[PDB]
């Protein structure tokens with residue numbers, strides 16, 4: 277279960293974040309580990325498409341090769357805090373698993389600048405028990421976390437040294453698909 281009420285960035289600039297570009301997850305912190313994907317790859321595109329706030333997600337397990345894309349319409353709770361009902365799709369946007377009540381994630385932008393961000397997400401999917409997940413994002417897939425985002429990690433009362441890096445996984449992304457999915 278999730279336990280954090282993440283605080284959104286003071287002065288969060290929604291148009292800059294939701295500009296249609298891609299964000300790569302460089303480091304993550306899951307508060308309920310299991311025995312994971314200690315090795316994982318993820319990226320997202322965020323933007324407004326035909327007046328609707330959307331996000332397109334990509335997940336890839338670099339060891340098992342398990343891959344999936346999602347598209348979500350985001351609903352606003354408050355500045356920088358959203359609720360997203362996702363639909364699993366192929367890379368071209370064809371639906372594989374339709375939107376279902378009960379299958380959603382919350383998303384909070386705790387910090388963001390033009391190149392980096394810190395987010396919190398709480399996933400709800402059917403029957404699985406899931407916990408809070410924090411992610412450090414960058415516009416450059418290979419960027420080491422800079423002082424602005426690491427300071428935000430500290431301000432959230434988290435230890436950046438506990439975050440797991442995604443950089444040693446040889447991850448390659450289909451950026452074109454992520455961007456096109458925003459319209460689906």
Ligand code: HEM
Pocket residue numbers: 301304306312313316317318320333335344345346362363364373380381383395397399401404409411
């Ligand atoms: C912006 C960051 C992220 C968001 C918004 C997000 C969102 C989601 C959503 C919506 C699903 C369900 C998709 C579906 O069933 O169609 C999912 C599944 C999953 N995510 Fe993420 N995720 C993010 C980052 C990550 C990262 C970094 C990891 C690495 C630990 C991760 C691990 C997983 C796994 C293992 C599942 C499969 C859950 C299952 O079905 O039991 N995610 N994620």
Ligand SMILES: [N]
Pocket residue numbers: 399409
């Ligand atoms: N996730």
